[PDB]
A paper describes a structure:
HLA class I molecules, encoded by HLA-A, HLA-B and HLA-C, are highly polymorphic and can bind and present a range of intracellular peptides to cytotoxic CD8+ T cells, as well as regulate innate immune responses by interacting with killer cell immunoglobulin-like receptors (KIR) expressed on natural killer (NK) cells. While much is known regarding the role of HLA-A and HLA-B molecules in protective and aberrant immunity, comparatively little is known about HLA-C. Compared to its counterparts, HLA-C is expressed at lower cell surface levels, is less polymorphic, and has evolved to have more extensive interactions with KIRs, thereby playing a key role in regulating NK cell responses. To elucidate the role of α1/α2 domains and the peptide-binding cleft of HLA-C on differential expression, we solved the structure of HLA-C*05 in complex with a HLA-C*05 specific peptide, SAEPVPLQL (SAE), and HLA-C*07 in complex with a HLA-C*07 specific peptide, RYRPGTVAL (RYR)27. HLA-C*05 and HLA-C*07 differ by 22 residues, of which 15 are located within the α1/α2 domains, with ten of these being involved in peptide interactions, namely Tyr9, Thr73, Asn77, Lys80, Tyr99, Asn114, Phe116, Trp147, Glu152 and Arg156.
The structure of HLA-C*07 in complex with the RYR peptide revealed canonical P2-Tyr and P9-Leu anchor residues, a large network of interactions at P1-Arg and a secondary anchor residue at P3-Arg. The P1-Arg in HLA-C*07 was stabilized by aromatic residues, similarly to the P1-Ser of the SAE peptide in HLA-C*05, with an additional salt bridge formed with the Glu63. The large P2-Tyr sat into the B pocket, stabilized by a hydrogen bond with Asp9 and van der Waals interactions with Tyr7 and Tyr67. In contrast to HLA-C*05, the B pocket of HLA-C*07 is deeper due to the smaller polymorphic residue at position 9, which is Asp in HLA-C*07, as opposed to Tyr in HLA-C*05. The P3-Arg of the RYR peptide, which was buried within the antigen-binding cleft, acted as a secondary anchor residue when binding to the HLA-C*07 molecule. The absence of the Arg156 in HLA-C*07 (replaced with a smaller and hydrophobic Leu156) allowed the P3-Arg of the RYR peptide to fit inside the cleft of the HLA-C*07 molecule. The buried conformation of the P3-Arg is facilitated by the presence of small residues at position 9 (Asp→Tyr) and 99 (Ser→Tyr) in the cleft of HLA-C*07 that allowed enough space for the Arg97 to move away from the P3-Arg. P3-Arg is stabilized by a hydrogen bond with the Gln70 and salt bridge with Asp114. While HLA-C*05 uses a large network of aromatic residues in both the A and B pockets, the HLA-C*07 B pocket lacks two of these tyrosines (Tyr9→Asp9 and Tyr99→Ser99). The presence of these smaller residues and Asp9 in HLA-C*07 is consistent with the preference of P2 Arg/Tyr for HLA-C*07-restricted peptides, as previously reported.
Author numbering:
A (entry chain B): 0 to 99
B (entry chain A): 2 to 276
C (entry chain C): 1 to 9
The structure:
Amino acid sequence: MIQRTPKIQVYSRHPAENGKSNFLNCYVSGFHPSDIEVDLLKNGERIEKVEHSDLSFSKDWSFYLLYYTEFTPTEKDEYACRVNHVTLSQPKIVKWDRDM
Amino acid sequence: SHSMRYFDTAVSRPGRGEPRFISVGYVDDTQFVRFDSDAASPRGEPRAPWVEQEGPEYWDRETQKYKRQAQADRVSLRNLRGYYNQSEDGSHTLQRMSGCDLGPDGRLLRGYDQSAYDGKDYIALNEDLRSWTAADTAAQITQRKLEAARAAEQLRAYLEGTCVEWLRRYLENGKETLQRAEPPKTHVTHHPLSDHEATLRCWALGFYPAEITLTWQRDGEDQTQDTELVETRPAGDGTFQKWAAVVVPSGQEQRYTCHMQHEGLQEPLTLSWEP
Amino acid sequence: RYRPGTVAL
Ligand SMILES: [Zn+2]
Ligand SMILES: [Zn+2]
Ligand SMILES: [Zn+2]
């Protein structure tokens, strides 16, 4: 069947200043089929209170979801988004760069 | 260009239960409703505050249409699974987009009802709103089954009455958020990759609606070939984010401009890297 | 408001 591998972007809601509350977003788009597993990580380990949007899809029929959580950034803490799908042999871990 | 769209997705899980039906309704790029058949007691729920008001008949009835639609899709999969003699053990996806483009005079611009099987165009409703189009032989089988039923008559009445009428009501009920334009906030950045080149990345943030055009230009000439352009992404709070980037040889940064078109801006915005 | 019921494919 026709299968498309997810594009993943990891970013915050607003530009991140330390000690100021914000949201960590992990946006997954352009994938097919819909079944997909997504976890957000803090310094390696899972974050538990993660919400997500309802399954929708673009003009070319490919799916997108947003996984997000409130957080408070810190110079030392490292964040990421882990993403498993059929088209991947291995779960992809994408590091949050701070650039926006 | 105001719009309501419903996005249905039915996926088969042959060795683990009935297929799952999930539907989400948008007015433009703002979600207002969902139905998930894997929910505990499945009902159509509000996802925006400008439809929470609607009475019990409204919500009971939408739910009623949703449950009946989920039954037809399970059936629709079961049938289509036949029409390609596919094993009863691989998962399969049916997707549907139905909705309305509104006009200047509060009138119908364009109605939709299209589908796709396993991520691919299967059958669609034509512009006139009383004729169909298929992709292969297998969707000819459906075309007869839908002409016989007079589906394009009952969809035309839906998307010429109900959809336009109820869109207009949603736009008016959620005017504070649906019919504002919040144009983009912008900056340009410069990251060196080597001694001799740097990525220039033009950022648009805090915009609604999502439709936006970002482009890079070297002395007027678009750099359509060199411009990396991520998919627009939600900020989480109703606004969107996008960037466009172009690797420029250092020394020549001043010949580059970033051009930006969005509903919330009346003139194109032109932007450059100022050291 | 959602589309009305149509015969399966
Ligand atoms: Zn308007
Ligand atoms: Zn060099
Ligand atoms: Zn180089």
